[PDB]
Amino acid sequence: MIPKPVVQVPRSIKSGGVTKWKEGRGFSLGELKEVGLNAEQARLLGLPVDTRRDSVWPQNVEALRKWLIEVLEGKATPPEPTLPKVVKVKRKRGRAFRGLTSAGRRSRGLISTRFRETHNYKFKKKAKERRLKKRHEATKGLGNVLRISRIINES
Amino acid sequence: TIDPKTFYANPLPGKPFYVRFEVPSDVAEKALEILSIARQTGKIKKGTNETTKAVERGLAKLVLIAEDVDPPEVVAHLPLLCEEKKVPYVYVPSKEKLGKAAGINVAAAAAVVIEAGQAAGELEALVNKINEIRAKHGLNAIPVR
Amino acid sequence: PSAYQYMAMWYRKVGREVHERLMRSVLIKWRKEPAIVRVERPFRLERARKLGYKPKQGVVVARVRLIRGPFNRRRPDSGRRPKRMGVYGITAWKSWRQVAEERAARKFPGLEVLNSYWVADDGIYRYFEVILIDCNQPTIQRDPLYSGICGREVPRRRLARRLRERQRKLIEHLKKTLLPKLKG
RNA sequence: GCGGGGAAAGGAAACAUCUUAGUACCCGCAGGAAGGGAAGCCAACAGGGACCCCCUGAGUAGGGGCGACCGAAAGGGGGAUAGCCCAAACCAAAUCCUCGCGGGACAACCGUGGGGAGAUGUGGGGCUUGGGCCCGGGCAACCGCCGGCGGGCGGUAGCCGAA
RNA sequence: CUCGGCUUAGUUUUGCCGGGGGAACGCGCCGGCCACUGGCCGGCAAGGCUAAGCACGUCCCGAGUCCGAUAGCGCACUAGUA
RNA sequence: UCGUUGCGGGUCCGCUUACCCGCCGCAAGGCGGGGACAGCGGCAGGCGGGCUGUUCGGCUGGGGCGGCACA
RNA sequence: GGCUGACUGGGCCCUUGAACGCAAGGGGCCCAGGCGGGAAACCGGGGCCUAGAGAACGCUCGUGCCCCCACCAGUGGGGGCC
Ligand SMILES: [Mg+2]
Ligand SMILES: [Mg+2]
Ligand SMILES: [Mg+2]
Ligand SMILES: [Mg+2]
Ligand SMILES: [Mg+2]
Ligand SMILES: [Mg+2]
Ligand SMILES: [Mg+2]
Ligand SMILES: [Mg+2]
Ligand SMILES: [Mg+2]
Ligand SMILES: [Mg+2]
Ligand SMILES: [Mg+2]
Ligand SMILES: [Mg+2]
Ligand SMILES: [Mg+2]
Ligand SMILES: [Mg+2]
Ligand SMILES: [Mg+2]
Ligand SMILES: [Mg+2]
Ligand SMILES: [Mg+2]
Ligand SMILES: [Mg+2]
Ligand SMILES: [Mg+2]
Ligand SMILES: [Mg+2]
Ligand SMILES: [Mg+2]
Ligand SMILES: [Mg+2]
Ligand SMILES: [Mg+2]
């Protein structure tokens, strides 16, 4: 059973000091260094590696040491390496016409802000919600119906 | 450090803006001969990227610049750089001939003699004659390195 | 500093006045050529190389001239609420650079637009140069950057087999050089 | 599915800002999916760690004749998981393509000859665990091209099947 | 940066387009909900690609508290037919 | 008004090469005139039913005029 | 003749609005602070009584050793409660 990295949930000001743990994206380079591995070797063993993460958690180090011993003694089988296994690049047609060049990417807002905050993304996201009547788009004017009803029922 | 708006203030008629003084055909042909001789007996470099690095690094002795560079701004920095580093330079009329003298199969917009094995004597005479042309045109002298 | 760093000086403050003198003559010719013209070499070589240009067979550099200003917004000819009746100041969400790339692509059917950059402005026109590549040319197809546009296929049997071998050899090596340290 | 152009009716118990709606529709351009994607990020001194999609945060913050109405994001739980390249520094033609001939699983490629590209830089190198540059040590080197041969499974007709 | 405009929850603070002005360079530059200053923290824009996991139904397969010839698709039929 | 808008001389004069207008030419380019004006784009003020959207209240011995018996 | 109570902070009630929901406005009775007139009682929160009267948003002024503005501190600016 290949271990999963454990990382701390970022402690917000809103939380007031309450903290919890979560499963991380991958093991940090500091944790891998304590068990004598680099990013490439760890990825060849099937481990998820996160070179962005700076923290080193002893519980992650301990889980890595236990599982590596099992692997190096023939008791555990490493999964497939966490490196690309296919290369699939399609021929592109009409990049300029679909706004995929750098000029198109700029006008779409993708240079200055995240994809989720671009205006075309907002247009498509809300169109889907209204088409499926999902979440808040099942009721138009939901906020005002709630607001007036709260006043009447909490007076 | 040289300010281009005064250096290139008064261009010559019928020449690109980066050409500062007129070189007679005899002087240009001599430079091409020296570059060819230096290629077999000494050390040369060719192409704008290698010529610019040689001038910056202080290893240049003579810089050859072609006058028919189609977008002129490819080589226009070289005369400014040579004046700053006090490296003598001369203009040659054709980049196709400059490339052939450099011993390649394509044109060269610029070339530089690093060391003149057997051409050192002729190189000194060429630099003096270039210096007279610069004085005629009003530019200060650049001594032979 | 590469010669390309020095070539960029003509589009910086130190070289603007000399460059602006040059363009006043050059633009006279460009105003009389066809609106879209293929050129032998890019006008801003250092900028073109940063955007992916190389002088290979099948790489096309085209100069595009177009009228600047806002797009031709039409005054509506039927009923509208007042907010929808204005004309002046209303522009397109497309830049003129994208418009230039698209017009270039129409002149070279089947070619793919890689990138483009600004070259010059005058009172009425704006000039761009567009880099296009022919994805059918063998020189283009194998280029590491152009293959991202022209397509690339690596069989899964190649990568997976290579990765499996590397994993197997690593485990044997780590048995000798790492297992004692882990258990020590 | 992607880019652009782009209403009104109706609603606000009138109506113009507003909404309807970046909708209808129009123009252009792709794929079997598209688009997105590898921190000039988010956070708050505690830490997360590319992206898309689903559940939530939440009709909360916020916008608004602060009216009608509009409306996130971070964070949390999941599906799934993957990371790389071009340019440049440094080297400087060591490079690519095409054709003929010989070899080479009908290939890649090797040898040789001709043609084209290429110093306005082909190619090598390099990609945050920054790199280039100098010195030393070590192979479990690293990276890439071809898809021949053997084997297995599946799809495109069917066959057998109690009393 | 500034002016006009479309847009956005983005509000003295969203993205962009157009007109005019317009940097610096790692001893630098950018962000931390008005601007500036100091501290601290986080990063390196303006070049390119990227499987999987997500949309759809001409088509194929399966299912059904669905309809049963004025119903159910406009069409159970020499129906997009006369 | 900002830009296009450049070059000489002491806000003024001149110039042409920009730009504009016409003639010739298949094109290349030539000739003449104007000329940093004009024209064109942005921004700003004025005129602007040429065109677009709308509002043109209520009570009422029917409506309208009146009145306000509308606070 | 002497004055400014046409006062500061609040509460309760009556009427507008019958029994019976429901603005603004107006009136009455008080408590506290600090005054004016008066020997004192007492009266004064405009005019002897019943008329002269205006929501939300926005702006402006007064007030407070006042509250807030996105990692922290500061300056300018902005917002908030009455
Ligand atoms: Mg909604
Ligand atoms: Mg309407
Ligand atoms: Mg409707
Ligand atoms: Mg209405
Ligand atoms: Mg109506
Ligand atoms: Mg996909
Ligand atoms: Mg894609
Ligand atoms: Mg909306
Ligand atoms: Mg190269
Ligand atoms: Mg049977
Ligand atoms: Mg950068
Ligand atoms: Mg029927
Ligand atoms: Mg029947
Ligand atoms: Mg004018
Ligand atoms: Mg005008
Ligand atoms: Mg009318
Ligand atoms: Mg009215
Ligand atoms: Mg009436
Ligand atoms: Mg009347
Ligand atoms: Mg009343
Ligand atoms: Mg009552
Ligand atoms: Mg009253
Ligand atoms: Mg914050």
- Residues 59-98/A with CB within 7 Å of nucleic chain D are 82-88, 90-94, 97-98
Nearest to C113 by CA among C122, C121, C103: C103
CA of A95 to C1' of D72 (A): 31
The residue written with tokens 């005058």 in the block is C122
In this structure, the number of other CB atoms found within 10 A of the CB of residue A108 comes to: 18
SS3 category, B112:
strand
Residue C71 Cα to chain centre, angstroms: 23
Q: Which subunits count as partners of chain B given 3+ CB pairs below 8 Å? A: C
SS3 category, A120:
helix
**Cα dist from C16 to A45, A70, A79, A144, B5, whole Å:** 56, 67, 60, 59, 9
Helical segments of chain B, H only? 4-7, 25-41, 48-57, 77-85, 95-101, 120-137
Task: Return the biggest CA–CA distance within chain C.
Answer: 86
Do B and C make contact via 3 or more CB pairs under 8 A? The reply is yes
Q: Is C166 exposed, middle or buried (0-12, 13-18, 19+ CB in 10 A)?
A: middle
- Residue A23 assigned as binding residue: no
At a CB cut-off of 8 Å and minimum separation 6, what does B52 contact? B77, B78, B81, B110, C1, C2, C3, C6
Helical segments of chain A, H only? 29-34, 39-44, 58-72, 102-107, 119-132, 142-153
Enter the tokens of residue A99: 């706004």
Q: Are B78 and B16 in contact (CB under 8 A)?
A: no
Helical segments of C37-151, H only? 45-50, 96-107, 138-141, 147-150
Give C118's strand partners: C128
Min distance C29 CA to chain B CA atoms (Å)? 14
Find and give the residue nearest to D31, measured CA to C1'.
A90
Q: Are C120 and C89 in contact (CB under 8 A)?
A: no
Q: Are A23 and A7 in contact (CB under 8 A)?
A: yes
What gap in Å lies between CA A108 and CA A64, rounded to an integer? 44
**Cα dist from C42 to A118, B110, C39, C103, whole Å:** 33, 18, 7, 18
Method used to obtain the model: cryo-EM
B121 near C CB under 8 A: no
Q: Work out if A150's Cβ lies within 7 angstroms of strand D.
A: no
R_g (Cα) of chain C, nearest Å: 26
The resolution in angstroms reads 2.0
Residue A44 with chain C: CB contacts under 8 Å: 163, 166-167, 170
Nearest to C181 by CA among A72, B54, B34: A72
Among the partner residues B4, B52, B72, nearest to C3 by beta-carbon distance: B52
In this structure, the number of other CB atoms found within 10 A of the CB of residue C173 comes to: 10
SS3 category, A87:
strand
Enter the tokens of residue C180: 């004692």
Min distance A94 CA to chain C CA atoms (Å)? 7
R_g (Cα) of chain B, nearest Å: 14
In this structure, the number of other CB atoms found within 10 A of the CB of residue A3 comes to: 17
Enter the tokens of residue A100: 């995929």
Provide the terminal-to-terminal Cα distance of chain B, rounded to the nearest Å: 21
**Closest nucleotide C1' to the C-alpha of A118:** E15
Residue B5 with chain C: CB contacts under 8 Å: 17-18
SS3 category, A122:
helix
The closest ligand to the CA of C79 turns out to be 2
The residue written with tokens 């958690």 in the block is A57
Q: Are C66 and A58 in contact (CB under 8 A)?
A: no
At a CB cut-off of 8 Å and minimum separation 6, what does B132 contact? none
Do A and B make contact via 3 or more CB pairs under 8 A? The reply is no
d(CA A72, ligand 10 centre) in Å: 56
Nearest to A101 by CA among C124, C51, C69: C51
The conformational region for residue C52 under phi > 0 = left, psi -120 to 50 = alpha, else beta, is left
Q: Work out if B26's Cβ lies within 7 angstroms of strand D.
A: no
Enter the tokens of residue C50: 């940063």
Enter the tokens of residue B102: 């450099």
Does an H or E element contain C169, and which?
helix C156-177
In this structure, the number of other CB atoms found within 10 A of the CB of residue B45 comes to: 22
Q: Work out if C16's Cβ lies within 7 angstroms of strand F.
A: no
Q: Work out if A131's Cβ lies within 7 angstroms of strand D.
A: no
Q: Is A135 exposed, middle or buried (0-12, 13-18, 19+ CB in 10 A)?
A: exposed
Q: Work out if C73's Cβ lies within 7 angstroms of strand F.
A: no
